[PDB]
RNA sequence: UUUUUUUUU
């Protein structure tokens with residue numbers, strides 16, 4: 001851990017993924033990627049008559065009450081009339097004028113209002129009325145920390161402005177964008193805007209950028225703020241709006257050089273808060289029982305429940321479904337429809353929560369229970385929801401500086417997050433929020449506002465992205481909350497060994513290429529260098545499988561058959577190889593002749609994970625074809641098949657290698673020299689003394705997950721920069737026989 | 753035996 005200098009061979013020159021990347025960049029230079037399409041817009045004329053940035057509320061309202069659309073040529077529908085009548089009475093509308101009067105005279109502003117006042121929906125439209133996006137050929141961006149948020153609000157606003165979704169108003173998500181060339185109002189995730197910022201540093205396409213729910217302080221959000229602070233210095237024609245329902249606005253104002261704060265009072269509908277007098281021993285059972293209680297007793301309305309993970313959510317779903325059916329049968333309760341909601345679900349299955357409440361034949365109020373993670377915690381309006389059940393728990397990221405690794409842990413939520421969850425109700429109609437914790441806990445136990453992501457997350461990718469933005473001196477760079485210089489330096493070190501950054505500190509073609517991929521830098525470099533080993537398709541598949549949650553299903557009470565079913569796909573010396581076998585068998589014609597989903601439910605495999613993996617693989621394949629990477633493979637008959645795959649794996653995961661103790665028990669890592677063991681779910685039954693691993697996991701003991709045997713020769717060949725003897729501490733178990741391998745190599749060279 | 757969220761079809 002006490003690293004210091006150590007001269008080593010040039011990583012950039014010795015890296016095979018770098019050569020692969022030079023090839024890729026050259027091929028990209030040969031056929032330049034097609035430029036963006038200019039934006040299509042109405043030439044306007046009913047807008048003229050006003051000096052720029054001086055739009056009043058009265059004029060905007062006069063344009064609104066008109067029979068024709070100001071931005072399109074369409075005539076207004078009765079739906080638009082009703083929706084207008086509804087939204088004109090929103091608390092945010094009464095302050096419209098003032099908002100304008102600030103937005104016109106300030107370059108950067110902060111906005112704080114009550115939950116469900118109409119911030120995300122009405123503010124960008126106000127911006128549209130003051131600005132001239134169609135005349136100056138620019139777009140306007142509203143940023144949501146969620147996919148579903150952006151999609152849903154895009155739908156709602158599309159209905160509000162009487163435009164077809166995907167035309168003038170649209171959303172852009174990594175798996176699907178509805179943004180065309182006529183799109184003026186663009187809802188998007190912070191990651192998408194970050195990508196557009198990575199391809200275009202100054203974001204010339206946008207004249208006004210809005211960041212909603214900035215209280216979460218996600219990675220992309222903070223990076224975007226840090227960038228925009230400099231962008232505003234370069235171009236004064238850009239305006240930035242920071243929105244949130246709750247915030248420590250002092251930090252934001254002081255960061256953006258004494259920026260103005262607009263706080264709007266007023267509540268659309270009252271949301272009542274209920275606290276438990278005592279502490280709930282088991283939050284899950286408490287959640288289930290309380291949901292069933294609201295189902296049995298409370299008035300008509302749908303229930304929104306928050307939980308931890310997808311496993312817990314599924315369990316809660318089947319339990320609430322069962323006992324709910326028993327409630328309908330024996331106690332004559334109304335029909336109940338439970339819908340799950342988490343990120344790993346397809347957008348359709350996520351959309352399934354907006355379905356109407358069940359019809360009633362008996363007269364008893366039928367209702368819907370939406371069991372979701374914190375994906376619906378921020379900026380999302382469900383029409384049917386009246387009740388909100390909150391255990392007060394979520395899954396958050398924890399990072400150990402000693403180990404330098406990040407994992408997920410169940411943690412108590414924040415005060416802001418609780419105000420958000422409670423703020424999900426009381427929109428369509430007055431809401432009731434049951435919090436499964438004491439008010440004393442809310443006042444003291446709950447954190448003020450969730451620890452920032454930068455201060456938590458590993459910065460191995462963040463640095464690469466920041467470098468892609470065009471930031472040279474990251475140490476001097478203006479963050480809102482600067483991370484630990486130690487972590488930064490070690491990250492730069494990792495990227496230096498991966499040959500993404502040269503010795504001078506600039507971006508290599510390998511880095512510039514690997515930045516475009518939605519992968520962890522190691523996975524990226526691996527994938528890039530894959531086709532040089534003539535096995536890029538297999539490596540692609542493996543990466544896709546590593547990008548998806550655990551495929552294998554293992555029942556608590558039926559472990560034997562599951563372990564056998566896994567042993568069928570199992571391959572000696574390699575977990576990755578086994579994964580490749582699994583996907584190759586899932587995509588096989590035979591598995592389709594059986595029943596795919598049936599076949600997955602016959603071989604103890606997760607269909608959701610497999611289909612998600614197929615999707616991810618398709619995306620990555622499209623990107624590889626876009627940045628001109630050759631899809632290459634070799635015959636199974638060739639003995640260098642497995643060897644090629646292993647080598648390509650080492651190309652990106654050379655820093656994560658373990659060596660078994662010579663004449664002892666357990667393993668030890670090359671990096672940082674830590675005593676470790678092999679995870680029980682690993683296929684390798686024999687003692688391979690040299691292994692490459694994918695995950696580092698701490699539980700009962702320090703375990704190493706997902707491994708594959710490798711020859712030290714290959715490691716020396718691929719990454720000479722990291723495996724020069726000069727880098728590592730004095731005579732330890734690793735170095736002692738590593739030097740023997742070196743003696744071997746030198747004898748080989750000596751004999752020739 | 754332990755993937756909340758996000759990252760150009």
Ligand SMILES: Nc1ncnc2c1ncn2[C@@H]1O[C@H](COP(=O)(O)OP(=O)(O)NP(=O)(O)O)[C@@H](O)[C@H]1O
Nearest residue numbers: 115116117118119120121156245379380381427428
């Ligand atoms: N079908 C619908 N979809 C979305 N909103 C609806 C719908 N029907 C009625 N509304 C109302 O329109 C409002 C949408 O405005 P919204 O952008 O969600 O406010 P908000 O303040 O940004 N929410 P938040 O910032 O997370 O506290 C909702 O609060 C609802 O009251």
Ligand SMILES: [Mg+2]
Nearest residue numbers: 119120212379
């Ligand atoms: Mg909002």
